[PDB]
Design a protein around this ligand. Structure first.
Ligand SMILES: CC(C)[C@@H](C)/C=C/[C@@H](C)[C@H]1CC[C@H]2C3=CC=C4C[C@@H](O)CC[C@]4(C)[C@H]3CC[C@]12C
Ligand SMILES: CC(C)[C@@H](C)/C=C/[C@@H](C)[C@H]1CC[C@H]2C3=CC=C4C[C@@H](O)CC[C@]4(C)[C@H]3CC[C@]12C
Ligand SMILES: CC(C)[C@@H](C)/C=C/[C@@H](C)[C@H]1CC[C@H]2C3=CC=C4C[C@@H](O)CC[C@]4(C)[C@H]3CC[C@]12C
Ligand SMILES: CC(C)[C@@H](C)/C=C/[C@@H](C)[C@H]1CC[C@H]2C3=CC=C4C[C@@H](O)CC[C@]4(C)[C@H]3CC[C@]12C
Ligand SMILES: CC(C)[C@@H](C)/C=C/[C@@H](C)[C@H]1CC[C@H]2C3=CC=C4C[C@@H](O)CC[C@]4(C)[C@H]3CC[C@]12C
Ligand SMILES: CC(C)[C@@H](C)/C=C/[C@@H](C)[C@H]1CC[C@H]2C3=CC=C4C[C@@H](O)CC[C@]4(C)[C@H]3CC[C@]12C
Ligand SMILES: CC(C)[C@@H](C)/C=C/[C@@H](C)[C@H]1CC[C@H]2C3=CC=C4C[C@@H](O)CC[C@]4(C)[C@H]3CC[C@]12C
Ligand SMILES: CC(C)[C@@H](C)/C=C/[C@@H](C)[C@H]1CC[C@H]2C3=CC=C4C[C@@H](O)CC[C@]4(C)[C@H]3CC[C@]12C
Ligand SMILES: CC(C)[C@@H](C)/C=C/[C@@H](C)[C@H]1CC[C@H]2C3=CC=C4C[C@@H](O)CC[C@]4(C)[C@H]3CC[C@]12C
Ligand SMILES: CC(C)[C@@H](C)/C=C/[C@@H](C)[C@H]1CC[C@H]2C3=CC=C4C[C@@H](O)CC[C@]4(C)[C@H]3CC[C@]12C
Ligand SMILES: CC(C)[C@@H](C)/C=C\[C@@H](C)[C@H]1CC[C@H]2C3=CC=C4C[C@@H](O)CC[C@]4(C)[C@H]3CC[C@]12C
Ligand SMILES: CC(C)[C@@H](C)/C=C\[C@@H](C)[C@H]1CC[C@H]2C3=CC=C4C[C@@H](O)CC[C@]4(C)[C@H]3CC[C@]12C
Lengths: 311, 477, 7, 354
């Protein structure tokens, strides 16, 4: 029955017009000639392409700048990510109503190799077995310190509110709800850590700062930075393992050392009222100061035009 | 029996039986107008039976009493009267009513839809003796979050036609046409009012936290850019003049609806600010034929729906920078209900495969209902021939000269110029047009249609459906 | 199943 | 809400008091299993650390469960010399602590690596795989707890370990062509971790990489629970025995040297592993532990119960540590639908006024 009538269905529609134009909001945001990387940043930061304030997003933003990819960054949120978590890259529209598929975080480096503006093997080289052990310091020891000090410290409540929840909405009721979810999720991840966590109350995971041991997280970070400073001192060059160019390991460490110095180098936590050295102070005091100048050198390579990055 | 209604009459007393929970003061409001209009003139049963005939569904609109409990025992008054105008001038009337169940609790599960789908319902009615109601709904399952609901409804000052409702809401809505889902959380305050002429008014205040999550892998850049949180605090007015003889399958009469919504402007506060209005005019017209007197069953209908979404600045100033609209608020058009013959949301701008909304739209319909041969026109199932047109456009700042590229907001003159251009786009070019033939069923819980549609004029990127299409619902164009 | 305890 | 912030102190990284050799300390660990002093990887490492750095009479081992200690975490050390509670292996070693810089950095690196990645691998073998749980480890957990507890604690342990190994992406059916791809992912994930560990000279016989004895004890804790436990799915034991003979030799020599004869020679409290738990196996104490464990599963109240209970325990540990934690904050229902009469009578009547 469909076969004889196919000579009739193919006739319609009788008139086909040009597509309707996209809304104004879509035209302003999604139209661009350069691939756009969506990260956690502010509208003023995104204008100059300055480093994002999220260490997970800053890791990939640094590598893409080392990969010599020409791109622009835009503020975004995890809800828009194809993998449910930032960052991700949208290549520019081929036509005003069509766009290629988004590039997740894992496929960013493959995208950069296809769009030279060259051998990018150093940015995704397989680390030596010893280097795998040290990478656990960055991904676990330093990450847990970042999460505990940012989300769970009342001292950084103003900063956390300004960075993450204030741009989300202007409603105080919605802001309070979003802030609680952020702290619940952050406390859950730190609770999984062996040092500052490992406590089990019931089947549900621990999701409060009460299940987190602040000293165990803080002490592990202080030990991690001293260890990383020792590893960097071993190399005869300015980068880890003697490489002549920064690699995936350097970008991974830089994503934490930069933000710790930027946002937590204040003299209020280091004051006797708290009795603990701030994260940004430990970064500059680690070893003889290798991690401080490594952060300076990494900025001089990926952001040569930028200045005023101390705090 | 009709000669009993032509005689003079004068009612003496009335009694209501079984209203133990409802306060008598509430009962007074319906019966005092009955009580005041008594012994007015002869043949008053012509007046009396209709005015109590008004009362029966007046009490039914309270929803307190079971629909079956309306036993009327009107009779001639037993005691005599001094020189009465007629032997049956005096009457005795008593009404029997049984109240509905005070509390209703419901729960269950349905593994056919989801592996852990379960729902819980509880209804409490006629609290405090004044027809206050309270309904609580809770739903869970798998691959979904918990959904709650709690509505408290009450008549105002004993008037059944003026009902105030307070609702607390938490739900998630799937939106496959835009490759995302919307999480809702907020409260609504409604004041529904029914005019003496039958017109329905409704003034509602809403404050809902919208959140676009769960983007499908095919989500377009437009959907991704609009993901995230948004608080909409809006005040909306709904008007409805329904004169259709059968609202579920109109053969005669007309319908008019207006839905005006103001969000974010002035005292309202939130992440959005606009003034959205919709107008839906419909009508039908029976046509007679020489071959059969009386009700022929054939009729010709029509329809016309309009809508404008105007961005507004926040604060108390009419002149100022206005943010462009978001995918949550933009109109959606197309489908078996809105514009027959297209994919659900198949009209308007499309980003890849996602149907992103528009700011200005205008849909229309022309249809004719016919009865099948060897079947009476009183049958609820009929043949339908229809032709649907629609347009859905989006506001653009192409007409502006220059604006700061950092800012996303548009000045007041820019928005006005954009709206004028958007409305002008409706009147040029043939609208997206579809036509077809189908069968319509008017079974009074929902209208059922089995349509064979065939798109005629279409904009590139719009999705038509050339095959059979089934649409079930209470609202049709 | 779908229970209903109305009273 | 004050439940998601660093605790306030009466007027955050308060250091623990320095330990001095001589004071009696008590280590609360899980019970013996699989012929090992303990069943948990961290607890077994802590036992080995004490057996090498402290004399046989300077410490005691107490078989316990997380509900029996204020830290809600095992292993935990009770330094009776100052009555402080220290939870976690790293915190215990730091408390008891008295190219070196390259060696010190390596010890820190592998300590984080073992916790970060060797732990999920261990959880996958013993907890995520339902075949090994129902036949090898769940009997072991129940054998070291008082009667009503094995229905509350071991289920809670599995949930933690399942979350711990969740980042691997594998689940229970992979413990077993769909079978072949599951098997190769088992060997791939194990090789991704065991390759790093094979870099270090754990036996400390010379060459390789030299690390402090603190992390060598930790290495044994994770490796011993991966090799020795006889489970119905010995795939992880098979990989280590064949591909990595050096790790197999290290575990066997370490066990024979540090835990000769099943490890029963350790100074368990009250002269035995089971007798040690008797101090907290009283009927009243066990009942409270079970009841508190039950309350946490209430769908709405239970979640807030554990958050309040954990905060209370957090203050107790901090108070013992010499800190000064700030104090924390803590009919009409019968008058309706009952008691009051119905608002009207069954009969209401009106008549024409005079
Ligand atoms: C019966 C009347 C009142 C109305 C409602 C019906 C209109 C339909 C059935 C018919 C009437 C005129 C037709 C019409 C006129 C001219 C053209 C131009 C041609 O290139 C494409 C088809 C198109 C656009 C067709 C489409 C179908 C139309 C619009
Ligand atoms: C558009 C929304 C946002 C809000 C601001 C608008 C409210 C107006 C338009 C509504 C609110 C109350 C309404 C109202 C109240 C009562 C009556 C009496 C009736 O016999 C005629 C209509 C009339 C006069 C209607 C007309 C429409 C009114 C005035
Ligand atoms: C097809 C749609 C648009 C339906 C709703 C049509 C509506 C219009 C044509 C109807 C709706 C109300 C009607 C209407 C209301 C009241 C009166 C007053 C009377 O003294 C003259 C006719 C007049 C003026 C009629 C004319 C026809 C009107 C305006
Ligand atoms: C004149 C009055 C007093 C009485 C006799 C009848 C009025 C009706 C029949 C008239 C009054 C206004 C008329 C009317 C107004 C406007 C339009 C819009 C047009 O697009 C379709 C016809 C339509 C809908 C017509 C139909 C016929 C109507 C509704
Ligand atoms: C209810 C009676 C008393 C009167 C007032 C109502 C008249 C309305 C409802 C009727 C009268 C004339 C009708 C009318 C005339 C002509 C057409 C053109 C047709 O293509 C679409 C329907 C349409 C537009 C219908 C709609 C319904 C109308 C407007
Ligand atoms: C050479 C000129 C005179 C030709 C091209 C113009 C014809 C005009 C009269 C036609 C062309 C397109 C038509 C048109 C397009 C779309 C719609 C939307 C529909 O909901 C109402 C009618 C409306 C607004 C009609 C009205 C009549 C228009 C404007
Ligand atoms: C929420 C549920 C699980 C609660 C109320 C039920 C508890 C009962 C069924 C459980 C709790 C503790 C259990 C209990 C504790 C200890 C012993 C000693 C043993 O030699 C015989 C069985 C016996 C006596 C069991 C029997 C079952 C008991 C009494
Ligand atoms: C019959 C006696 C001699 C002994 C052997 C029997 C003990 C059983 C029946 C008792 C002991 C502990 C009890 C028990 C412990 C804890 C819970 C968790 C709760 O969320 C569901 C019930 C459940 C699972 C109950 C069920 C009944 C159990 C399993
Ligand atoms: C007479 C003796 C042999 C009885 C009392 C035994 C007591 C001991 C074994 C303790 C151990 C665990 C306790 C126990 C566990 C849990 C609960 C659930 C609670 O909701 C009621 C009490 C109940 C059931 C208590 C009762 C006393 C028990 C069963
Ligand atoms: C003496 C007893 C009968 C009294 C204290 C009852 C307590 C209730 C509130 C407790 C007892 C057992 C508990 C219970 C047992 C097992 C489970 C399965 C789990 O997946 C969801 C929670 C659930 C369903 C919890 C909910 C709370 C219950 C039902
Ligand atoms: C004779 C020429 C000039 C015609 C056929 C060409 C174009 C225009 C004017 C025609 C083509 C399709 C027509 C058309 C299609 C369908 C409808 C829907 C109906 O509810 C209102 C009229 C409306 C909107 C008419 C109006 C006139 C249109 C738009
Ligand atoms: C510079 C000025 C003179 C330019 C921009 C023109 C108009 C200004 C004043 C704007 C400010 C508020 C606007 C305004 C408010 C609300 C609505 C309701 C909507 O349903 C139709 C448009 C309408 C009526 C628009 C029209 C344009 C207005 C009146």
């Amino acid at each position: 029955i469909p076969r004889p009538l196919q000579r009739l269905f193919d006739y319609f529609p009788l008139r086909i017009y040009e597509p309707n134009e996209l809304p104004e909001r879509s035209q302003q945001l999604t139209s661009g000639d350069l691939p756009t990387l969506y990260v956690f940043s502010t509208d003023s930061d995104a204008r100059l392409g300055l480093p994002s304030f999220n260490p997970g997003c800053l890791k990939w933003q640094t590598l893409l700048r080392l990969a010599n990819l020409d791109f622009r960054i835009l503020p975004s949120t995890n809800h828009s990510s194809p993998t449910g978590s930032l960052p991700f890259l949208l290549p520019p529209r081929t036509s005003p109503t069509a766009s290629p598929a988004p590039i997740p975080a894992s496929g960013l480096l493959s995208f950069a190799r296809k769009n030279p503006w060259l051998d990018l093997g150093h940015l995704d080289a397989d680390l030596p077995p010893r280097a795998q052990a040290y990478l656990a310091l960055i991904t676990h020891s330093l990450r847990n310190a970042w999460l505990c000090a940012l989300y769970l410290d009342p001292t950084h409540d103003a900063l956390l509110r300004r960075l993450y929840v204030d741009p989300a909405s202007s409603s105080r009721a919605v802001r309070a709800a979003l802030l609680h979810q952020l702290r619940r999720a952050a406390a859950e991840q730190v609770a999984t850590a062996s040092s500052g966590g490992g406590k089990i109350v019931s089947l549900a995971p621990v999701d409060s700062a009460d299940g987190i041991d602040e000293e165990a997280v803080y002490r592990s970070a202080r030990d991690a930075l001293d260890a990383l400073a020792s590893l960097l001192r071993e190399s005869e060059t300015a980068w880890f393992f003697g490489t002549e160019r920064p690699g995936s390991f350097d970008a991974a460490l830089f994503s934490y050392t930069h933000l710790m110095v930027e946002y937590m180098s204040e003299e209020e936590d280091t004051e006797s009222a708290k009795g603990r050295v701030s994260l940004g102070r430990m970064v500059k005091e680690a070893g003889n100061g290798e991690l401080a100048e490594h952060r300076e050198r990494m900025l001089g390579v990926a952001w040569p035009e930028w200045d005023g990055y101390r705090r | 029996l009709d000669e009993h209604i032509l005689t003079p009459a004068s009612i003496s007393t009335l009694e209501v039986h079984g209203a133990t929970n409802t306060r008598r003061s509430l009962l007074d409001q319906i019966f005092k107008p009955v009580l005041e209009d008594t012994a007015a003139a002869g043949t008053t049963l012509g007046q009396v039976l209709d005015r109590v005939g008004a009362a029966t569904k007046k009490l039914a609109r309270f929803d307190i009493f079971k629909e079956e409990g309306f036993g009327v025992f009107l009779s001639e008054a037993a005691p005599p009267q001094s020189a009465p105008p007629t032997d049956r001038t005096d009457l005795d009337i008593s009404i029997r009513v049984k109240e509905k169940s005070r509390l209703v609790f419901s729960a269950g599960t349905d593994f056919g839809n989801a592996e852990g789908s379960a729902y819980t319902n509880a209804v409490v009615r006629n609290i405090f003796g004044g027809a206050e109601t309270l309904t609580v709904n809770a739903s869970t399952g798998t691959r979904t979050r918990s959904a709650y609901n709690a509505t408290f409804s009450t008549p105002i000052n004993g008037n059944p036609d003026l009902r105030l409702s307070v609702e607390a809401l938490r739900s998630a809505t799937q939106k496959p046409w835009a490759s995302h889902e919307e999480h809702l959380t907020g409260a609504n305050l409604r004041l529904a009012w029914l005019t003496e002429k039958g017109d329905t008014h409704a003034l509602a205040y809403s404050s809902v936290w919208r959140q676009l999550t769960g983007l499908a892998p095919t989500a377009s850049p437009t959907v991704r850019a609009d993901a995230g949180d948004s608080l909409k605090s809006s005040l909306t007015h709904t008007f409805t003049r329904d004169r259709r003889d059968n609202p579920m399958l109109p053969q005669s009469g007309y319908l008019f609806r207006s839905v005006s919504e103001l969000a974010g402007w002035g005292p309202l506060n939130g992440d959005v600010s606009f003034a959205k209005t919709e107008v839906e005019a419909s009508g039908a017209l029976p046509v007679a034929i020489p071959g059969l007197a009386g009700k022929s069953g054939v009729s010709v209908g029509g329809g016309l729906r309009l809508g404008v979404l105007y961005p507004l600045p926040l604060g108390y100033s009419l002149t100022g920078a206005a943010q462009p609209s978001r995918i949550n608020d933009r109109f959606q058009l197309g489908g078996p209900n809105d514009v027959r013959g297209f994919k659900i949301g198949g009209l308007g701008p499309h980003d890849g495969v996602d149907a992103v909304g528009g700011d200005v739209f205008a849909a229309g319909s022309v249809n004719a209902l016919l009865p099948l041969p060897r079947t009476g026109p009183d049958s609820p199932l009929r043949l339908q021939l229809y032709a649907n047109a629609g347009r859905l456009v989006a506001l653009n700042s192409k007409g502006t000269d220059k604006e700061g590229k950092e800012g996303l907001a548009m000045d007041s003159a820019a928005v006005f110029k954009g709206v004028k251009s958007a409305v002008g786009k409706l009147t040029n070019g043939i609208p997206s047009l579809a036509a077809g033939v189908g069968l319509v069923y008017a079974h009074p819980v929902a209208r059922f249609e089995l349509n064979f549609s065939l798109p005629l004029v279409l904009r590139r990127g719009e999705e038509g459906r050339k095959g059979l299409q089934v649409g079930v619902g209470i609202s049709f164009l | 199943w779908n229970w209903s305890k109305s009273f | 809400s004050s439940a998601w912030s660093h605790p306030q102190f009466e007027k955050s990284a308060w250091s623990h008091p320095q330990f001095e050799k001589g004071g009696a300390v008590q280590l609360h660990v899980w019970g013996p299993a699989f012929g090992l002093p303990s069943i948990d990887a961290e607890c077994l490492a802590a036992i080995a650390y004490l057996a090498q750095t402290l004399g046989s009479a300077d410490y005691q081992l107490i078989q316990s469960s997380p509900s029996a200690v204020p830290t809600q975490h095992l292993p935990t050390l009770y330094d009776s010399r100052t009555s402080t509670w220290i939870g976690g292996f790293t915190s215990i070693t730091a408390h008891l602590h008295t190219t070196a810089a390259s060696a010190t950095a390596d010890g820190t690196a592998y300590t984080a690596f073992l916790s970060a990645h060797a732990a999920p691998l261990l959880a996958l073998s013993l907890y995520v795989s339902s075949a090994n749980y129902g036949a090898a480890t769940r009997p072991a957990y129940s054998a070291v707890l008082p009667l009503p507890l094995p229905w509350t604690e071991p289920p809670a342990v599995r949930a933690a370990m399942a979350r711990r190994a969740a980042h691997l992406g594998l689940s229970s059916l992979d413990a077993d062509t769909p079978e072949q791809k599951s098997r190769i992912r088992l060997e791939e994930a194990a090789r991704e971790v065991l390759d790093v560990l094979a870099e270090v000279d754990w036996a400390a016989g010379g060459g390789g990489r030299q690390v402090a004895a603190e992390v060598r004890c930790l290495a044994f804790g994770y490796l011993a629970l991966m090799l020795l436990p006889d489970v119905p799915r010995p795939w992880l034991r098979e990989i280590m025995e064949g591909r990595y003979p050096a790790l197999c030799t290290f575990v066997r020599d370490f066990r024979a040297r540090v835990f000769p004869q099943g490890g029963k020679l350790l100074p368990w409290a009250d002269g035995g592993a089971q007798a040690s738990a008797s101090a907290s196996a009283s009927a009243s104490a066990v009942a409270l532990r079970f009841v508190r464990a039950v309350m946490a599963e209430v769908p709405l109240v239970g979640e807030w119960w554990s958050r309040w209970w954990t905060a209370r325990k957090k203050r107790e540990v901090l108070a013992s540590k010499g800190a000064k934690p700030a104090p924390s904050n803590d009919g009409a229902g019968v008058f309706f639908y009952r008691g009051l009469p119905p608002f009207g009578e069954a009969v209401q009547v009106w008549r024409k006024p005079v």
